[PDB]
């Protein structure tokens, strides 16, 4: 199977580019995985504070990256597809009333919501010898909803 | 009995031990030599450039993104990752036991998928993965005795020439120059100027 | 038995004893932020005073590399002295590493550290573990690093933890951005455009390639070294707004001195800070493991924990399979033999034979004070091998003397030692003389001779001198047994 | 590959191309893994001579036969190229661990050489009516079943030294397989070559 | 694809790793085969078509 | 011929800063390859309508 | 002759592989021989034979 699976990606290396930006951004991953399913493990909060998003949320960032390093498991996700994401929810009355579309929401977020890279002060080749090298640092992401706004 | 045979053929015992004696000589001329085999788990090192960005921004956009997917790799016992300003610097451990060439495949195939991912300067850039199991035969060192050449150009020299050369000798896996620093164009900006021209 | 029980627990042991290898490998670390031309100041003046020492022929200098943690830090660098031939040196490498430290003990600019070329390839530099303590609650790295010096604090408390040191480092100067997004976009600006100005202005904007001399080249657009040294090098920076008007960098962003990590390390998808410390000299690298653990456990939160690499990972991993493995090779050894004696008691003889050897080998390394390497560990293999050769032939001709010949078995003990005592004695005079040269072996890979030499003289002399006598006691001993269960 | 040979080749290269280099540049070879593996070679070599010659000396002393050195002589040197022949074949390489371990190898072999020859001297002066060729078969008639219990009790001993994993584990099956390949030549050796020869 | 369907624009910090960003209209608004008519677009002229 | 393909990728990622943009963009590409031509298969049309 | 220093020259196919086996055929005829003669003194336990 390890050949098989490298055969495959030499193949699929090739028409990757071929493909539509948006397909090849998400990414095109070949697994050795036989699809048929071997064992569920459900994970469930008796309490039922936490909800349907924060239980699959935990056992994403905690419980898959473990049970992906076990030798034997091909696959390991979870049926919720429910992991974190800023949702922006347009509403298509007030865009219409402001008179902004949704493609400018799409530049301004895309634009505004980025990190980009800074070079440091005081670096070589300078002819008047500074004391000290230092990184400029930004923080382009924002974090919460309230930024987002 | 089994040694009466031999003592009572003297001849028998000689040709064996000269056989045997062939056999010693022809393995001892086709033995590999080297200063340590293989004790080392095998590793890969997964680097990724983002020139003029930090630290933070590294371990999170390229850093991130290339360790997730890494992931899952079979024969994985741990993976560690590095960020320094404009560079990320990834090492695979790997099962002791599995072949380099295996693991640096599989580390490539997942790398593959994750590139696109990345900001666009790291995909400029590229990523590179490689196999750091193999040991220092020898390090040489290329000087300038007199201060004709500088530093850049005694790395270009060696890039170019004598690189290439001992890279053809048989037995030599490759040869790397530490200088990192390679011809460029470099365009100075005057930002006095910039601003006097608009 | 009991004294040998002693013994290996009053041995320290190691992994590799540590060696000559011709190179001092010196880390040069200046302040944190330090610019490359005092590293390089500083690494000029090291050269020149190791140019007085005799013994140093030549030294390869690194400068703005650091080689604790690989990554290029214009505040560190990394000195190789090339030693001279071993031949032609008197002074050995941990005598001029001590000079090194005493002519810069003194309090300077920079911290230098004088250790030994490792050994063997894939250990550790100098013998530190890897211990790394994953963040999973995604703390801030300024408060990871105040827990991880509560953990140095408890660990620098406990003798087993010599020299506990993390790699953490937030100490580094950084120049803090601050967007002013209100002034951005009422300037009519994209933030992209402005982050490529200061990418080329301050930074490397790296836009194309050329071709020269048949290869191609980057080309590389940064402004000049005298406009980019100041916090105030945001001033002349002007980037155009939409409405076609020049606009200083200045009027919406702001450079504000902090300080932060210039490593930043994750390990197994987290954040993780990396602990090196070394065992105390009584306790082995075992013990150092599990004490740091253990404080680590109690210093740190329940967030942290603790993930290991390199020399902990083989500790952990390596002697779970040796006692099965041992286990084996001996019930597998005495069912040889007793197929070969056709007798369950009788190699209970060899076996009881084997641990004079150790003995002896464990004796003398003890003497001459030696630890517990693993090139010890192979001696004791071929020491236990030797011994066990001896024991057989010496209890074969007993069985004989006893069957064949008739004799009491009193008689056919002593007439099967004075049989097997010349052949004993021509081996180990053979090969102690043989091996002796090694316990006085030259510089180059000096340390593993000796322990290995010496290991072997020891467990030689003591197989040869004290086996001897022994084993025809055993034999009478278990054939009186088996005399007695027969009546 | 062989280390040795490739650094001598890249030095020689490196010659040849300082033929052709600019006014001022140098070139120099700092550190050379080749140097520890090359000493570690020499070291073994004195290493068996003088056991060669001390076999002789101790030979020559107790069984006061000059014709019975040339035994030993014969003896040992064809079981260590049995031994290499066997490393080859199964994929080692002559590196410093192994090297050690030849180093231990040695006593092995001159331990069944020696033991061999004296059991058949022994026998040889207990009876004056017996000849040579009935002393060397009633020497081996004892002791051939000891030698295959001592060569299986050896490898019973260096096998699961080798099961052991790690890196302890491989540095200890390095000389654990070598000296278990050393007891099955020396071994048979013994059996075959060294009463015909005695 | 940013009204009706969900428009994945970039990441976002979030715990330590990557989360995506994803613009949509509000349920309401994707709701019926009438979707089309509350949704407008900018020419090139600026005029809301 | 397996292991040689292998091998030839790890080397070509292995050196990935050395290549210039545009193969980037486009890909190179590794296949194992024969310079043995088994047969060569002619198809033709009879009515000469194609 | 013609070429000179500047120029090599190299092999391929059915060239590089008679250039390169050159000296094989006589290498395994002299060892053949080498093992005839050992094995035929092993059986008859001669020599000269």
Request: net charge negative; aromatic share 10%.
């Amino acid at each position: 199977p390890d050949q098989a699976a490298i055969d495959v990606n030499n193949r699929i290396s090739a028409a990757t580019a071929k493909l539509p930006e948006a397909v090849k951004k998400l990414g095109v991953t070949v697994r050795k995985s036989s699809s048929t399913i071997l064992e569920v493990v459900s994970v469930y909060s008796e309490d039922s504070s936490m909800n349907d998003i924060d239980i699959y949320n935990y056992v994403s960032l905690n419980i898959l990256d473990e049970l992906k390093r076990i030798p034997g498991v091909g696959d390991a996700s979870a049926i919720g597809n429910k992991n974190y994401s800023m949702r922006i929810w347009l509403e298509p009355d007030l865009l219409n009333k402001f008179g902004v579309t949704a493609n400018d929401v799409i530049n301004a977020v895309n634009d505004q919501n980025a990190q980009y890279a800074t070079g440091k002060i005081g670096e070589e080749p300078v002819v008047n010898k500074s004391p000290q090298v230092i990184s400029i640092t930004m923080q382009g992401r924002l974090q919460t909803p309230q930024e987002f706004e | 009995m089994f040694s009466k045979f031999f003592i009572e053929r003297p001849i028998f015992a000689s040709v064996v031990a000269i056989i045997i004696s062939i056999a010693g000589i022809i393995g001892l001329a086709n033995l590999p030599v080297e200063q340590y085999p293989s004790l080392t788990p095998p590793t890969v090192q997964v680097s990724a450039t983002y020139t003029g960005a930090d630290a933070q921004t590294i371990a999170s956009t390229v850093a991130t993104p290339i360790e997730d997917a890494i992931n899952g790799v079979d024969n994985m016992i741990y993976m560690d990752s590095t960020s320094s300003p404009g560079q990320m610097k990834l090492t695979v451990y790997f099962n002791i036991g599995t072949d380099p060439d295996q693991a640096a495949i599989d580390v490539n195939n997942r790398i593959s998928a994750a590139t696109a991912k990345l900001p666009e300067a790291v995909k400029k850039l590229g990523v590179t993965v490689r196999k750091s199991s193999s040991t220092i035969l020898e390090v040489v060192s290329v000087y300038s005795e007199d201060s004709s050449m500088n530093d850049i150009d005694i790395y270009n020299y060696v890039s170019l020439n004598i690189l290439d050369e001992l890279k053809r000798i048989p037995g030599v896996g490759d040869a790397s120059a530490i200088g990192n620093k390679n011809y460029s164009m470099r365009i100075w900006l005057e930002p006095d100027l910039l601003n006097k021209f608009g | 038995i009991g004294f040998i029980a002693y013994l290996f627990k009053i041995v320290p042991s190691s992994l590799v004893p540590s060696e000559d290898q011709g190179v001092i490998m010196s880390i040069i670390n200046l302040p944190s932020g330090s610019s490359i031309h005092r590293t390089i100041e500083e690494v000029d003046t090291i050269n020149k005073n190791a140019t007085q020492m005799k013994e140093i022929s030549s030294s390869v200098s690194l400068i703005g590399f650091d080689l604790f943690t690989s990554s290029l830090k214009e505040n560190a660098a990394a000195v190789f002295f090339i030693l001279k031939d071993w031949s032609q040196r008197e002074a050995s490498s941990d005598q001029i590493i001590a000079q090194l430290f005493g002519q810069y003990a003194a309090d300077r600019n920079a911290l230098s550290y004088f250790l030994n070329l490792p050994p063997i390839p894939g250990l550790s530099l100098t013998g530190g573990f890897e211990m790394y303590a994953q963040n999973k609650s995604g703390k801030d790295y300024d408060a990871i690093q105040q827990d991880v010096n509560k953990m140095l604090e408890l660990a620098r408390t406990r003798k087993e933890l010599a020299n506990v040191r993390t790699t953490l480092d937030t100490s580094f100067p950084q120049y803090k951005l601050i967007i002013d997004r209100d002034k951005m976009k009422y300037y009519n600006l994209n933030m992209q455009d402005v982050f490529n100005t200061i990418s080329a202005t301050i930074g490397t904007y790296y836009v194309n390639d050329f071709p020269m001399l048949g290869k191609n080249f980057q080309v590389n657009i940064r402004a000049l070294g005298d406009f980019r040294n100041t916090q105030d090098a945001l001033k002349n920076i002007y980037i155009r707004s939409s409405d076609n008007k020049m606009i200083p960098l200045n009027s919406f962003l702001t450079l504000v001195r902090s300080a932060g990590p210039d490593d930043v390390k994750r390990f197994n998808l987290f954040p993780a800070a990396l602990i090196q410390g070394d065992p105390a000299p009584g306790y082995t690298s075992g013990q150092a493991i599990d004490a740091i653990a253990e404080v680590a456990k109690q210093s740190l939160g329940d967030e942290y924990s603790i993930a290991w690499s390199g020399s902990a990972y083989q500790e952990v991993s390596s002697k779970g399979a040796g006692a099965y493995a041992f286990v084996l090779g001996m019930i597998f050894v005495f069912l040889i033999l007793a197929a070969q004696y056709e007798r369950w008691l009788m190699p209970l003889a060899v076996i009881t034979a084997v641990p004079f050897a150790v003995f002896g080998s464990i004796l003398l390394v003890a003497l001459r004070g030696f630890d517990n390497d693993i090139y010890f560990q192979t001696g004791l293999l071929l020491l236990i091998g030797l011994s066990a050769k001896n024991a057989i032939l010496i209890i074969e001709f007993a069985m004989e003397e006893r069957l064949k010949k008739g004799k009491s078995i009193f008689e056919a003990a002593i007439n099967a030692a004075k049989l097997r005592f010349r052949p004993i004695i021509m081996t180990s005079l053979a090969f102690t003389f043989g091996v002796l040269p090694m316990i006085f072996a030259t510089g180059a890979g000096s340390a593993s001779r000796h322990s290995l030499g010496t290991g072997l003289i020891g467990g030689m002399i003591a197989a040869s001198t004290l086996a001897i006598f022994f084993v025809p006691l055993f034999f009478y001993l278990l054939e009186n047994f088996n005399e007695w269960l027969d009546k | 590959a062989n280390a040795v040979n490739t650094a001598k080749l890249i030095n020689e290269k490196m010659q040849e191309l300082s033929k052709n280099f600019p006014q001022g540049l140098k070139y120099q070879i700092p550190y050379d893994t080749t140097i520890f593996v090359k000493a570690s070679i020499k070291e073994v070599i004195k290493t068996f001579v003088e056991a060669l010659a001390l076999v002789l000396v101790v030979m020559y002393l107790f069984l006061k036969n000059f014709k019975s050195t040339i035994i030993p002589m014969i003896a040992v040197p064809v079981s260590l190229l049995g031994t290499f022949a066997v490393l080859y074949v199964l994929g080692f390489s002559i590196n410093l661990l192994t090297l050690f371990a030849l180093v231990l190898a040695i006593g092995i072999v001159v331990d069944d050489a020696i033991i061999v020859v004296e059991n058949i001297d022994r026998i040889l002066h207990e009876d004056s009516n017996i000849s040579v060729k009935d002393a060397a078969i009633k020497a081996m008639n004892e002791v051939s079943s000891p030698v295959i219990s001592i060569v299986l009790v050896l490898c019973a001993v260096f096998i699961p030294v080798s099961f052991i994993s790690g890196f302890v584990g491989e540095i200890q099956r390095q000389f654990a397989l070598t000296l278990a390949i050393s007891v099955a030549i020396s071994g048979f050796v013994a059996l075959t070559l060294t009463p015909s020869l005695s």
